[PDB]
Design a protein around this ligand. Sequence first.
Ligand SMILES: Nc1ncnc2c1ncn2[C@@H]1O[C@H](COP(=O)(O)OP(=O)(O)O)[C@@H](O)[C@H]1O
Ligand SMILES: [Fe+2]
Ligand SMILES: [K+]
Length: 566
Amino acid sequence: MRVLGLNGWPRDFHDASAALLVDGRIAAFAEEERFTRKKHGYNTAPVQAAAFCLAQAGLTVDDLDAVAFGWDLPAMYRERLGGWPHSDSEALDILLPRDVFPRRTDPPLHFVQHHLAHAASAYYFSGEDRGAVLIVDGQGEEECVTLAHAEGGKITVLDTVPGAWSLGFFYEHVSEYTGLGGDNPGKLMGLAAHGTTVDETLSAFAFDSDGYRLNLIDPQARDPEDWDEYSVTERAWFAHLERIYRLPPNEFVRRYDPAKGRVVRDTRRDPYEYRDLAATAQAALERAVFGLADSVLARTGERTLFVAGGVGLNATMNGKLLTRSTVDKMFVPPVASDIGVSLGAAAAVAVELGDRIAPMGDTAAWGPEFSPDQVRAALDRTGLAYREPANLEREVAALIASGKVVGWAQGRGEVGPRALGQRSLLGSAHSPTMRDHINLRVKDREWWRPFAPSMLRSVSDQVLEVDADFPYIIMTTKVRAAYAERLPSVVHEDWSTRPQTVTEASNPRYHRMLTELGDLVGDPVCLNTSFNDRGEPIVSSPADALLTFSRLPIDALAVGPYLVTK
Ligand SMILES: Nc1ncnc2c1ncn2[C@@H]1O[C@H](COP(=O)(O)OP(=O)(O)O)[C@@H](O)[C@H]1O
Ligand SMILES: [Fe+2]
Ligand SMILES: [K+]
């Protein structure tokens, strides 16, 4: 079967994406924001992402066996907005506008339950027969947590928790409160490391062996003027935090900066001041999730754990789950946030149709790639001089080894929040100054933010103390003694890191580059941070990369077979 999964709706949505499964395999997969250049893919069908998928696969909607959506959208409309007004054709006309997607007839349209869709994106691509499923996000249609069982093709829901007790929402509001912003929980995760946990209950959570209990909010509490309990949980949390925490909300500040020539946003306080509140929001989250994980594992008698939902992006929480006593094996897909429920809905549908879903295979390079001719066009358009180095990987490794920062734009763009060697900014893992250089001089961002290393899987074994695939930078782990002090820019004081392991299969060109680096600095390890400027998505097109390369003091840009310097 050919199944096009979708996420993103014009009204009140985020992280639109489109994913194409063809006979179990991922033909194409991309996030709308990469094409629009507007962060987060807000309020829209994944028009361009879907456009790209069909084009990649060489298909029209008429070649499609099914279009799947990653929410029970008609059900949300019935429940929260009093009426699902559309016909499956009027639905498809909004999701796949007729002027971009011409069709002889509507394909079958499936709505897949939101958490099932998350669960699908973890299970069917993990490469494991069975396990415990733990879905933890902001909020699907009603629930905010799902504990389910994955066995022989089937996912079976055991229990759920209602939206008012969301831990995604909880985390977000703390994120907002700190001045970090609700749309930057990752930054909060990052800040935590610098904090000191005081009272992990925050005077709200009561923890137990199965999870948590939230006496601050009525669990059946619900918003009349909406279709999720965000605004509800917001008032409750914000009111609570100001009672118990020594600082009031950080407020955002809108002023005209005569140096920028714009009205820019800023925060009244330095968000670093809330590091204690951050350290504590993190600890609360870990403690709640440790309980849920334990619960769903013991009920399924499983020992492989599947995690998905926005909270599954907490690489710090993931790492601690991993080392947990109750966990032997664990899979969290790179697309654990909503961007994944396209892929998830498609999989759930493909499986119903008798398809067999193939494992991701330690890669997420499912977006757009570009011909050397196409790249050449983008360069020739700019009039910059460039080279076609005989051995791009060797020269690229030499630049990195010497402490220069290199823009790396190669192959199919990677899907998800984290760059994985398709669209990366690369630098020395070995440099004691690289971190402050990239954070402060290169990206103009907070000094306290961390960086993640890319290493050959073939030496993962000796660098990290867990001989396991870490393909997505979505799980923290500890480096071994021998490497703790060698990799100053990618290993915390803690000795923890968020690694990407690389295989020759997943990325021949990059694997080849790290290898060359090895011969230069001894370890085939490097710094690997997202390729973009403060307020943009990771770059997608060669034009996208030139543009960004233009306003960053990077040293060189390896885009396609071409090297460009400064
Ligand atoms: N690093 C992180 N740590 C903890 N929570 C996170 C992190 N990244 C994202 N989240 C949570 O993901 C939630 C949203 O999950 P997602 O499934 O993408 O959307 P929705 O809940 O709308 O379906 C947010 O409320 C946010 O708190
Ligand atoms: Fe979700
Ligand atoms: K273990």
